[PDB]
Each structure stands twice: as structure tokens, then as C-alpha cells.
Design an enzyme around this catalytic site. Structure first.
Site, PDB file in Angstrom:
ATOM      1  N   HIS A   5       0.813  -1.225   0.000  1.00  0.00           N
ATOM      2  CA  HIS A   5       0.000   0.000   0.000  1.00  0.00           C
ATOM      3  C   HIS A   5       0.858   1.293   0.000  1.00  0.00           C
ATOM      4  O   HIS A   5       0.293   2.382  -0.151  1.00  0.00           O
ATOM      5  CB  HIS A   5      -1.089   0.030   1.101  1.00  0.00           C
ATOM      6  CG  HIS A   5      -0.588   0.098   2.509  1.00  0.00           C
ATOM      7  ND1 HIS A   5      -1.061  -0.773   3.483  1.00  0.00           N
ATOM      8  CD2 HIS A   5       0.304   0.940   3.079  1.00  0.00           C
ATOM      9  CE1 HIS A   5      -0.428  -0.444   4.598  1.00  0.00           C
ATOM     10  NE2 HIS A   5       0.389   0.589   4.412  1.00  0.00           N
ATOM     11  N   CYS A  57       3.441   1.790   9.572  1.00  0.00           N
ATOM     12  CA  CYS A  57       3.279   0.658   8.661  1.00  0.00           C
ATOM     13  C   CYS A  57       4.660   0.211   8.153  1.00  0.00           C
ATOM     14  O   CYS A  57       5.554   1.036   7.982  1.00  0.00           O
ATOM     15  CB  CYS A  57       2.347   1.021   7.508  1.00  0.00           C
ATOM     16  SG  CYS A  57       0.590   1.055   7.948  1.00  0.00           S
ATOM     17  N   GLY A  87       2.599   6.319   9.614  1.00  0.00           N
ATOM     18  CA  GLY A  87       4.038   6.219   9.440  1.00  0.00           C
ATOM     19  C   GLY A  87       4.626   4.938  10.007  1.00  0.00           C
ATOM     20  O   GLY A  87       5.759   4.582   9.664  1.00  0.00           O
TER      21      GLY A  87
HETATM   22  C1  UPJ Z   1       0.252   2.718   8.586  1.00  0.00           C
HETATM   23  C2  UPJ Z   1       1.013   3.737   7.765  1.00  0.00           C
HETATM   24  O1  UPJ Z   1       2.178   3.996   8.015  1.00  0.00           O
HETATM   25  N1  UPJ Z   1       0.355   4.327   6.752  1.00  0.00           N
HETATM   26  C3  UPJ Z   1      -1.083   4.198   6.481  1.00  0.00           C
HETATM   27  C4  UPJ Z   1      -1.774   5.561   6.571  1.00  0.00           C
HETATM   28  C5  UPJ Z   1      -1.074   6.564   5.639  1.00  0.00           C
HETATM   29  C6  UPJ Z   1      -1.733   7.925   5.713  1.00  0.00           C
HETATM   30  O2  UPJ Z   1      -1.419   8.723   6.582  1.00  0.00           O
HETATM   31  N2  UPJ Z   1      -2.646   8.245   4.754  1.00  0.00           N
HETATM   32  C7  UPJ Z   1      -3.487   9.426   4.922  1.00  0.00           C
HETATM   33  C8  UPJ Z   1      -2.855   7.482   3.560  1.00  0.00           C
HETATM   34  C9  UPJ Z   1      -1.956   7.590   2.499  1.00  0.00           C
HETATM   35  C10 UPJ Z   1      -2.048   6.713   1.430  1.00  0.00           C
HETATM   36  C11 UPJ Z   1      -3.032   5.745   1.405  1.00  0.00           C
HETATM   37  C12 UPJ Z   1      -3.955   5.669   2.434  1.00  0.00           C
HETATM   38  C13 UPJ Z   1      -3.878   6.537   3.511  1.00  0.00           C
HETATM   39  C14 UPJ Z   1       0.420   6.658   5.979  1.00  0.00           C
HETATM   40  C15 UPJ Z   1       1.043   5.273   5.861  1.00  0.00           C
END
Ligand code: UPJ
Ligand code: UPJ
EC number: 3.4.19.12
Lengths: 304, 304
Positions: free
Chosen positions: A41, A145, A143
Site C-alpha cells: 500500500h 506501517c 508512518g
Molecule cells: C500505517 C502507515 O504507516 N500508513 C497508512 C496511513 C497513511 C496515511 O497517513 N494516509 C493518509 C494514507 C496515504 C495513502 C493511502 C492511504 C492513507 C500513511 C502510511
């Protein structure tokens, strides 16, 4: 003496954490040999996550779009491939700090340590368990993930988890290092409700043994039970049914303390039916289920 | 989201752990620059510990009697001196892995991570607090003495604790890195009972803020209180009296959540007077007091 929720020393895994950026998204990556593992993702925009076709989104990405940074030095990406829900970014340099490692898929009830990271920088380390509903109760912000779950057997790190999602109920979902999610969770922003969070019965019994070994014995009673009788009570209280395998797994602790597993089950049965009565066991006011019998044995003997 | 008892990444401190042997006794030592710090009781026999005269016992020891081993390589001891209750063994080689560091003496209520070690090998990492009675509720077995407590501010490790003793009630006692014990404890096998283990009120309030930030809000009520009124209740339940300093320290959390500190105090007052009623707060059935307001802020924002 003293019994604490203890995570593995995180040093070996700290030396593997890198920062991965793809477009506007920055998450963590695991650097082992010349490969960086990260959630797929990382290539999504907040719009894409509603219904992403990852093969399609990935066609639009090239090796130079994946910005991989280990500390302040940038890693050259020479290949990229998707394995289930993780990306494998082949770099031109093998991680000099790559420990001896295995990628393992753990079962629910099994515990592991999480090195919570942000921008490839570790922030903290805590102990988790893979819940029977295949979620984990972690501590992950945006951040985080790409942060991994692991176990250490002397000098070999067994990576078991990589953080991917937060369900709307505050619980967490992720994959093993082959990219397969634990349970039925998907890397999509959809209606994924967690199932019943049952209590890990064998882990509670293990923690009751740890308590007796450390002086907390008030809950010991004059009763015994059978596996079938205890299971009627475990069913009522959303506990995992106890099997002869769990009884056998508890054998070393039963042997050390002199308390038969079924007698300890009868203590757990009374605790379920009557509560703690304002008392505590190993500093806790509820029945702890995130210490396996192996964790109790390890901590009670000092395995390094 | 999600809130967990989180220890600092232990990597920087793992690279400092050495094994120290003096006669039949093996414990841990901290290797920073060309000095290895270890408890001075390493020179005692089980007979000596009843009433040891450390200056006298130390006259019988020479540099070659202190066997210092970092992994499988032996360190040459070129000097040895006693500073309060720790020995400082000067080695001929500066630890190449010495992180940026400070030696700090923490106050009760302050938290830190413990890297539990055996034979200079780290076994696990957990978060502790210096209790108001100057004990710590650790997890230490024979061989764990010399293990250290620390905090990390970006790249600088602030060592605050070194394990020395286990009191007959299962609680732990040790020194700062200058060898001064926390509280009134002595490195003697005598009748040292711990005082009242009061609850760290400011830490409980901080953890109540962490809970609201993560969705657990059931305990929020329509009441408020004053510092003096709350303190009457805190007195009754063996809680630390709340000061204007603690209220000010809670300011950032009050600001973020919109809940005034005194309103949160009234929630804590009701929890003390009425119990949890079989409910949980951040997965716990008792009021957690080993998260400082700074730990809550750090975890809730992702400081690395
Ligand atoms: C868990 C993690 O580090 N992340 C998931 C959420 C993501 C974020 O802040 N947003 C708003 C986002 C970006 C891209 C796709 C979905 C959600 C940061 C990374
Ligand atoms: C905490 C620790 O590592 N040690 C204290 C106990 C000690 C031990 O096992 N015994 C029996 C002992 C030896 C010397 C003096 C007193 C007690 C191991 C080191």
C-alpha cells in the site's frame, strides 16, 4: 524473581529498518540481504485505498520511484516485485547488519515483539500476541506501517509480522513476511470487523504458573477439574478450548511447580466464575493471556 | 492508535553489555568508552554479603582478577576503582559501540527501560518506573545484576539504573551509574523492607489522557474537583498528592484532548471511590501508573 511483559532485545531488528517513500507516502521497510520488504500500500494514494487494483497501480511505478533510505544514506533500487501484499525492493547493496533470520508464519496465541518505527527510525519495542481473531493489539500511528513483529532464537531472528492496517475498532492487522495477511483482513479501506477476541487459555494457565513461581499463590484452591468440565466454563467466558496438546505444552511448568495442569485449570475456573475480588496476580487485575508457556519458561530461567 | 507499555529500542545499550566475573561470581557490566561499570558486590562470596566491608574485600582483588568478556573477546583490565556501590574497571580498549550517553539520577515516578541481561547477554527489554518508595518492580534472576535502566533522547542514552538487589518481597533495588542506591537500600543481605508503594498520581492521569486519545472514554464524568479535594481522596487510596507542577506537566495533554486536568482528576476520584465495575481502560483492569506525561506524549505522536 519478578515477572514482566518483556520484549526481545531489538538491536538485531533496528539494524534492518529503512524508510521507504513512494510518491507522497512514507512508511517502513525491512532490509535483509539485498531486499527491502514493505507493505504494497506504499504505492497508494488516500483515494486508491478505497478499492485499489495493486497490479495496475504498480505498472505506473519504476525502480527509481521507490526512495529507500537507511539512516542518511540512500539505497539504489535495482528491482521491484509484488509478493501477495508486500513489495520486495531489490537493492544494489546487501544490508551489512543482516542478522541470521527466518520468515515464519505464526499461529494465534503465539507472541512476538514489535519494533514500532516511523520514517525507518525505531521508536519503541513492545510484546504482542497474534489474537485468536488474527488481529494484534498494537500501538501504531501513521508512518508505523512496515514495522515488524519478531522472535529471537539465540542469534536468529524469526520475522513473523509486518504492520499494514488499523481496523476502525483500534485493533491491528498485518501480514507475515511473505505478504499473506493473518486472518481475513485485506489491505483495502473497507468494512472489516474483527471477530470475537477470545482469551488464549493456555497462555493464561502459563501466566498462572509464572505467578506461583514468583509468590502470588492466593488463587490456588483445593479443587480440580477435567478438560471437558473446564471447557464448559471456558466456552461461557469466550476462552479458547483447552486441548491435550496445551496440557502437554504446560508439562514443564506443571513439573517445576508441582501443580497438576488440571488443578491449575480449576483455579482458573474459580477465577472466571468469581473474579479477582479486588486482588491482583503479577500486578495485573485481569487474567493475562499474552505470555506463552515458552515465554514463561524463558523468563523464569533467563534465556539469552 | 493503540496504547502499549513500550520500552526504548535496546540496540544502543546491547552494544555496551559485557560479562564480569570475579572469583565464583558472574554478573553484567556496562561498557562505555574504556570503562566497565558493574555492581561492587561482584567481589563478594555468598558469606561476605551478610556484612561486607567492601574496601577490605577489594584490597584482595587485582586488575587480573576481574574477568571482562564482550561476546567471545576478553578485555584487558588496566585499572579498578570503587565509586560508592559500583566498580569502575578501566579497560585498554574503548568500546567501539559506545553511544552518546549521560548518567542521570532519576526521581520516583520517572520511567525507564531495563535491558535484562545474563552473562553479558541481553535476554529481554521491559519498561519500569522508579517507585515512590525507591524500588522498581523488575524481572531479575541470579546473573541479572549489572543490567541497566535507561532512557533515549534521539541518539543519547541516559543511563539511570543499575541492578543490584532483590528485596525479600520480590521488589528490586539498585543504583544510578555513580553507584548511589535509589532510596535507603544497601548492597548487604539484611532486613531491608520497602516502604509504602504509593501510586504515581500524575502518571495515572497521563494514562487516562492516553485512554481518551485512543477511544476509551467511559470513565469520563460530569464532575470536577480541586487539587485539595482530590488530594483527600488520593491520601485515602495511597496515591501521591497532586501538585500544581503535575497539573502544569499535564498541560499539553489537557490542551490536546480539551479535558481540563481537574476534570480528569474528578474522573480518577470516581474511579478510586467506585472501582472499574468490571470494565477496562487501555486493556487494563487497574489504574496504570508507569507511563509519565512525557511517555504518553511520545507514544501518541511517534517520537523516534
Ligand atoms: C500505517 C502507515 O504507516 N500508513 C497508512 C496511513 C497513511 C496515511 O497517513 N494516509 C493518509 C494514507 C496515504 C495513502 C493511502 C492511504 C492513507 C500513511 C502510511
Ligand atoms: C543479581 C546477581 O546477578 N547476583 C546476585 C546473586 C548471586 C548469587 O547467585 N549468589 C548465590 C551469591 C553470590 C555472591 C554473593 C551473594 C550471593 C549472583 C549474582
Amino acid at each position: 524473581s519478578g515477572f514482566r511483559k518483556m520484549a526481545f532485545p531489538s538491536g538485531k531488528v533496528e539494524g534492518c529498518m529503512v524508510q521507504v517513500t513512494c510518491g507522497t507516502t512514507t512508511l517502513n521497510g525491512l532490509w535483509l540481504d539485498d531486499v527491502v520488504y514493505c507493505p504494497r500500500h506504499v504505492i497508494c494514494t488516500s483515494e486508491d485505498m478505497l478499492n485499489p487494483n495493486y497490479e495496475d497501480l504498480l505498472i505506473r511505478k519504476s525502480n527509481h520511484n521507490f526512495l529507500v533510505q537507511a539512516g542518511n544514506v540512500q539505497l539504489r533500487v535495482i528491482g521491484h516485485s509484488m509478493q501477495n501484499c508486500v513489495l520486495k525492493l531489490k537493492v544494489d547493496t546487501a544490508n551489512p547488519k543482516t542478522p541470521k533470520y527466518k520468515f515464519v508464519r505464526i499461529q494465534p496465541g503465539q507472541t512476538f515483539s514489535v519494533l514500532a518505527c516511523y520514517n525507518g527510525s525505531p521508536s519503541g519495542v513492545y510484546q504482542c500476541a497474534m489474537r485468536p481473531n488474527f488481529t494484534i493489539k498494537g500501538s501504531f500511528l501513521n508512518g508505523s506501517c512496515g514495522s515488524v513483529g519478531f522472535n529471537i532464537d539465540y542469534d536468529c531472528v524469526s520475522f513473523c509480522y509486518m504492520h499494514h492496517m488499523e481496523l476502525p475498532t483500534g485493533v491491528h492487522a498485518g501480514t507475515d513476511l511473505e505478504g499473506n495477511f493473518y486472518g481475513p483482513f485485506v489491505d483495502r479501506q473497507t468494512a472489516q470487523a474483527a471477530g470475537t477476541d477470545t482469551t488464549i487459555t493456555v497462555n493464561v494457565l502459563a501466566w498462572l504458573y509464572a505467578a506461583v513461581i514468583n509468590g502470588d499463590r492466593w488463587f490456588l484452591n483445593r479443587f480440580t477439574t477435567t478438560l471437558n468440565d473446564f471447557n464448559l466454563v471456558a466456552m461461557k467466558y469466550n476462552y479458547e478450548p483447552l486441548t491435550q496438546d496445551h496440557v502437554d505444552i504446560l508439562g514443564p511448568l506443571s513439573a517445576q511447580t508441582g501443580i497438576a495442569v488440571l488443578d491449575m485449570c480449576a483455579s482458573l475456573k474459580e477465577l472466571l466464575q468469581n473474579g479477582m475480588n479486588g486482588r491482583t496476580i503479577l500486578g495485573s487485575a485481569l487474567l493475562e493471556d499474552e505470555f506463552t508457556p515458552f515465554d514463561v519458561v524463558r523468563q523464569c530461567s533467563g534465556v539469552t
